[PDB]
Ligand binder design. Structure first.
Ligand code: HEM
Ligand code: HEM
Ligand SMILES: C[C@H](C(=O)O)c1ccc(-c2ccccc2)c(F)c1
Ligand SMILES: C[C@H](C(=O)O)c1ccc(-c2ccccc2)c(F)c1
Ligand SMILES: *[C@@H]1O[C@H](CO)[C@@H](O)[C@H](O)[C@H]1NC(C)=O
Ligand SMILES: *[C@@H]1O[C@H](CO)[C@@H](O)[C@H](O)[C@H]1NC(C)=O
Ligand SMILES: *[C@@H]1O[C@H](CO)[C@@H](O)[C@H](O)[C@H]1NC(C)=O
Ligand SMILES: *[C@@H]1O[C@H](CO)[C@@H](O)[C@H](O)[C@H]1NC(C)=O
Ligand SMILES: *[C@@H]1O[C@H](CO)[C@@H](O)[C@H](O)[C@H]1NC(C)=O
Ligand SMILES: *[C@@H]1O[C@H](CO)[C@@H](O)[C@H](O)[C@H]1NC(C)=O
Lengths: 552, 552
């Protein structure tokens, strides 16, 4: 019955109901006027007829390698480009935040309550007739059918871009500091109240935890030496709360920080590399500051490690991911002369679009072995069995599945994939098209336009019947990838704006923070400014195993 | 022993210890280079030799009434001026926040932990020799001596600017949503985790509270009709936790929202006016939105009331306070084209500089009576006895004490004044001069320069011996007021930057929020844009008592 159920306001205007069966669009600053913020203002016209499309843009970024190699060596230009990608991307995210599972309207509860993931688009009014608003049928197609028909994996489809199990697991570890659904409250609620790259997955979400994981000597994190390698301390020694199956023999119940990283050796591999890293910096810092004490050593390293993380995430992780030939750059000063909010609130659409389960192969091949999901899970004895060096070697040399394209979700995690479907639904999401539009994309005219092929498209059409009812999660995985890429337009276009705001909207990037002394001097500032995934592994892994997020 | 104890870094450069008995200044972006961020860069030189002083600036703003009457009538100019006071003021506040009681260095703990009030200047290293760093004696002068000698009130000194008990009590009520020391943790810790104008003092700091204070009908706040007037409901009925002396007969234990507002009828007078206001808007909104429900009515009104508050605070409260002839303006768009962070962390220095106890008269004269502190306190029977209209009349017609100038602290709240002295000390504050400098002021060369007279100045010199050791709180109250003003340079120059950031760094002011629909339409947007203290009282008080923050 809500007159805004039809989602009538275009170009980002807001729908306000002014009656019962009447509504109104707040086209403020949308650049468009008219009943539904549709009639563009003259200047809008100009901009529109001059702005390339994500694909043409993507094309240039993907081709002309030579030109790019010139561009990448002319600092001004590089900063000029990065600055723009940085600003244009960011302008797509509401900051300060608005809307959440419970609020389709601004509200102070929505703004102040940090327990909710924010929303890029409001939920759907509960009294709307069809689950996507007004379009489509009384109910969406059965998630089990959707799952099986176009999601489940038949033959493992490797990713053409090259993503290996180093990339796959980094993505798990990294995003898991912020993606932490409080399943006690419901999807839509988070436990990462730090809403970003705060490194809580290393240090603990709370002071008590952090304090239990800490050594209180030279600023270091607690640990243990097994074999000759440095591993996280036990749950029995530290007493931190970790999630482990009742049969772990104790002694393998590592502590770490993010309570769920004991569930997969790939996470614990990284969790150990970072513990190692923290300690390393404590040493580097302590050499510079004989006068410092345990806290300033700790607090300063945590700042450096957060810097390294943001550096690696843009110049290695996202670089690989992008496919672009342009050398992305992590340089805070780029936004010192730009209007930019140094704050972030993680949106559930970024949580949902980030369920990259179609990256997990069918077996984890750790040189001389090929473990099953069943044997890999919760098995840190494998980790102690092979040990980082030959783990970075194994995983560096092991492609991951393709995310976009369709039918690549391991039937092992099919329960998780269906869950993504079911939750988006209970969270009253909007169609893939509403989202596409919200992100300046052109809505798909047919399921086939979506997929770029016919059998899945066909199966979708049978199921959803109207392209304008196609759900966001499924369509992201069942979507025509760009050339020899891992994802399609939708995934890169929604996630990009989200990923860059949380990375650049971190306080260490603010003019007041971005200065040497913040990090313990000009030496700690290099640590951040010279960080790479290769350096992270070289410095903390036994033999300087060569690494990459790309399989050779 | 900390080599930074001497506070060697000038022009806002940060001190980093690089040794044990060696330090270093991070003059980044300070505009100055050289060992102590002292040698100005050429461009700095230009700015410096062209920037008037707070007093000459103040002069112009205080004089030339006619010229101002012209400027106040040419929109462009007015926006042009307000925009600059708004931007220049704000650039004096670290946002994102840095430093706190426990951290003299940036730290993630400092940044993320919302339980601490932030710090404009870092605390003093615990291993520094003298309590202000390196300068002064092993101990500051006895607070009791300082209190009695230059703080306590002899003969009531009324404020030459005109402040009445309407102003005095509004400042109490308003600032008390954000100034809420958690005396169980220690000074330096706050309970207003909303860090600003969120109106928790009306709605409750928490959802549970809010929910108990709420009616759940038409979006209204719970209440009761006594006589014929509308007053807050009881603690018995609602069950909210209020602070009241064990002898309040129940039935006079009003609920309200800020747990300490039952302690003084002046607070409860406002707390009842705002309850009334909320309800009023619920009615206005409901008329516009027959389709809305209890939540949207509630959440929307709260946003409007937060708007009115920011409107009244800049165009009436700060307007009066300022003494300026220029018409201040609350207009969010002024900052839509400016770099500005829409966030705020309340600093303890703002808490301390805001203890305006020298405003309280010796008796509360409520037309036909002159109550003593002892009879006014916790006495809401007086409120029910006289009743808002003749309360706004009484208080409108009653000057308040002068804050600056010296010796005007009611001996009745001398315990609170001494406490301000004690706590600043325990919180390891810095001298008035360090603060003056941090706020682009010229340090006082003598106690007499500070006071603008000799007996107190003399008593101070006996006591502190070095001007450079004079403490921030005392000097604020014992300071030469500007002409016929209530405070001096330091109070206006520190508190200004603070007060404007918290007011303008509110999400409702952000481009995404500042739009009609956010407030329920173009109607609720007027409520905000046409708000005045006179309107607030007219609409909710029995006979439209004329009001003002100025005594005739
Ligand atoms: C073998 C490793 C993996 C396993 C077994 C696995 C398993 C799961 C499970 C059981 C959930 C929770 C399902 C629910 O009840 O809602 C989940 C959530 C998630 N997974 Fe994975 N996953 C793995 C790898 C990945 C990878 C490589 C990514 C890539 C980014 C990923 C991203 C996510 C995200 C973003 C969530 C949501 C986090 C949250 O909201 O708490 N997963 N995964
Ligand atoms: C008759 C009313 C008043 C009484 C009896 C009173 C009493 C007190 C007391 C006992 C404290 C706490 C002292 C401590 O630190 O232990 C305090 C704090 C404070 N008072 Fe007053 N006061 C009154 C009026 C005012 C007014 C009119 C203002 C003007 C703004 C004011 C501003 C403050 C501020 C800013 C604080 C700090 C709040 C906090 O940090 O919790 N007070 N007052
Ligand atoms: C820098 C580049 C861009 O903005 O074009 C870029 C940045 C971020 C992403 C990105 C997209 C989805 C999930 C995580 C990151 C991406 F795919 C591409
Ligand atoms: C707007 C005006 C200005 O900046 O000049 C202004 C702003 C804030 C204050 C102010 C000063 C001391 C305590 C509280 C507020 C003030 F006294 C004057
Ligand atoms: C605006 O949208 C409504 C609802 O979708 C539609 O019925 C109406 O005709 C549209 N009007 C214009 C001018 O676009
Ligand atoms: C956040 O808000 C929702 C509803 O307003 C509520 O269910 C949840 O408990 C809130 N959490 C807190 C800590 O206020
Ligand atoms: C765990 O790893 C060990 C050693 O790598 C392996 O032999 C075993 O099969 C795994 N555990 C399970 C339950 O499969
Ligand atoms: C810098 O500050 C220190 C400590 O106050 C002082 O002793 C030193 O002489 C100053 N040097 C310069 C060049 O300002
Ligand atoms: C904030 O920090 C201080 C010390 O680090 C601590 O005492 C306080 O409990 C912290 N609060 C929270 C919520 O972390
Ligand atoms: C409170 O004030 C009322 C009305 O002004 C007065 O009659 C009464 O004596 C006071 N209460 C007490 C306990 O004295």
């Amino acid at each position: 019955a809500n007159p805004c159920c039809s989602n009538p306001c275009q170009n980002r205007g807001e729908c306000m109901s002014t009656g019962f069966d009447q509504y109104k669009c707040d086209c403020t600053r949308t650049g468009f006027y008219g009943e539904n913020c549709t009639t563009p203002e003259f200047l809008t016209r100009i901009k529109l007829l001059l702005k390339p499309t994500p694909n043409t843009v993507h094309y240039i970024l993907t081709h002309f390698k030579g030109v790019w190699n010139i561009v990448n060596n002319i600092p001004f230009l590089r900063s000029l480009i990065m600055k723009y990608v940085l600003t244009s991307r960011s302008y797509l995210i509401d900051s300060p935040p608005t809307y959440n599972v419970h609020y389709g309207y601004k509200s102070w509860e929505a703004f102040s309550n940090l327990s909710y993931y924010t929303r890029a688009l409001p939920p759907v009014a509960d009294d709307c007739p069809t689950p996507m608003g007004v379009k489509g049928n009384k109910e969406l197609p059965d998630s089990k059918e959707v799952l099986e028909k176009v999601l489940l994996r038949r033959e493992f489809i490797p990713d053409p871009q090259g993503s290996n199990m180093m990339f796959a697991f980094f993505a798990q570890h990294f995003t898991h500091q912020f993606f932490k659904t409080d399943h006690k409250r419901g999807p839509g609620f988070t436990r990462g109240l730090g809403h970003g790259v705060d490194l809580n997955h290393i240090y603990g979400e709370t002071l008590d935890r952090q304090h239990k994981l800490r050594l209180f000597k030279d600023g270091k994190l607690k640990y243990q030496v097994i074999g000759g390698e440095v591993y996280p301390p036990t749950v029995k020694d530290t007493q931190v709360e970790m999630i482990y199956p009742p049969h772990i023999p104790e002694n393998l119940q590592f502590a770490v920080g993010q309570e769920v990283f004991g569930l997969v050796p790939g996470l614990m591999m990284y969790a150990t590399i970072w513990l190692r890293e923290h300690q390393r910096v404590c040493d580097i810092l302590k050499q510079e500051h004989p006068e410092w004490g345990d806290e300033q050593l700790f607090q300063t390293s945590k700042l450096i490690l957060i810097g390294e993380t943001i550096k690696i995430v843009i110049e290695d992780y996202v670089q690989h991911l992008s496919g672009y030939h342009f050398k992305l750059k992590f340089d805070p000063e780029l936004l010192f002369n730009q209007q930019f909010q140094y704050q972030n609130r993680i949106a559930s659409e970024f949580n949902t679009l980030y369920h990259w389960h179609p990256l997990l192969p069918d077996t984890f091949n750790i040189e001389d072995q090929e473990y099953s999901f069943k044997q890999f899970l919760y098995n840190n004895s494998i980790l102690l069995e092979h040990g980082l060096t030959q783990f970075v070697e194994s995983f560096t040399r092991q492609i991951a599945g393709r995310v976009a394209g369709g039918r690549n979700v391991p039937i092992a995690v099919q329960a998780v994939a269906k869950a993504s479907i079911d939750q988006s639904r209970e969270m009253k999401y909007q169609s893939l098209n509403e989202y596409r539009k919200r992100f300046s994309l052109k809505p798909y005219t047919s399921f086939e336009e979506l997929t770029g092929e016919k059998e899945m498209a066909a199966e979708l059409k049978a199921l959803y019947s109207d392209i304008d009812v196609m759900e966001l999660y499924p369509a992201l995985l069942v979507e025509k990838p760009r050339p020899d890429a891992i994802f399609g337009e939708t995934m890169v276009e929604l996630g990009a704006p989200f990923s860059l705001k949380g990375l650049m909207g971190n306080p260490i990037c603010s003019p007041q923070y971005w200065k040497p002394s913040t990090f313990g001097g000009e030496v700690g500032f290099k640590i951040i400014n010279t960080a790479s995934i290769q350096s992270l592994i070289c410095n903390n892994v036994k033999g300087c195993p060569f690494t990459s997020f790309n399989v050779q």
